[PDB]
């Protein structure tokens, strides 16, 4: 029950993105200072990282999503072994699989997974700073038009 026009005709969705880095004043690529990308309602062809971002931004909004490398392009994943010997582990028992903790000297402690287990070492995934890095991708829904198929 709304007095409103028929929205069932296709249109015109006009966006534009630019990823740069956190804190760092570099760019990696953008499409806002050449020119803005077009899709029809429906056709999420970008990230899908951006593509749960898009249905929230609104027309005239920017929006600024950050998203992880494993998450864009998967390039250099953060999951690598470490040798661990069960010292560490005298009084907790372990499993292949399950969520282990391991209090650091800085008075924290960081959360993993362990990937094999013996009575002599264990085998524990971690991550690493060699690996990727975390980027936002800025964001603006420019607003969609209808269009024909003439001019």
Same mark, same amino acid.
């Given at each position: 029950?709304?007095? @409103?026009?028929?929205?069932?005709?296709?249109?015109?969705?006009?966006?534009? !993105? #630019?990823?740069?880095?956190?804190?760092? $004043?570099?760019?990696?690529?953008?499409?806002?200072?050449?020119?803005?990308?077009?899709?029809?309602?429906?056709?999420?062809?970008?990230?899908?990282?951006?593509?749960?971002?898009?249905?929230? *931004?609104?027309?005239?909004?920017? #929006?600024?999503?950050?998203? *992880?490398?494993?998450? *864009? !392009?998967?390039? !250099?994943?953060?999951?690598?072994?470490?040798?661990?010997?069960?010292?560490?582990?005298?009084?907790?028992?372990?499993?292949?699989?399950? $969520?282990?903790?391991?209090?650091?000297?800085?008075?924290?402690?960081?959360?993993?997974?362990?990937?094999?287990? $013996?009575? %002599?070492?264990?085998?524990?995934? !971690?991550? @690493?700073?060699?690996?990727?890095? %975390?980027?936002?991708?800025?964001?603006?829904?420019?607003?969609?038009?209808?269009? $024909?198929?003439?001019?």
């Amino acid at each position: 029950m709304q007095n @409103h026009d028929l929205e069932s005709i296709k249109q015109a969705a006009l966006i534009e !993105y #630019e990823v740069r880095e956190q804190g760092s $004043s570099i760019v990696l690529d953008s499409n806002i200072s050449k020119e803005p990308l077009e899709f029809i309602i429906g056709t999420n062809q970008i990230i899908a990282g951006l593509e749960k971002a898009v249905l929230k *931004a609104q027309i005239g909004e920017w #929006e600024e999503v950050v998203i *992880a490398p494993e998450e *864009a !392009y998967g390039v !250099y994943e953060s999951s690598y072994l470490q040798e661990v010997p069960r010292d560490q582990f005298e009084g907790i028992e372990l499993e292949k699989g399950m $969520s282990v903790f391991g209090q650091t000297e800085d008075n924290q402690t960081i959360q993993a997974i362990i990937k094999d287990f $013996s009575a %002599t070492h264990v085998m524990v995934d !971690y991550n @690493h700073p060699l690996a990727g890095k %975390t980027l936002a991708f800025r964001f603006k829904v420019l607003g969609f038009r209808e269009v $024909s198929e003439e001019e």
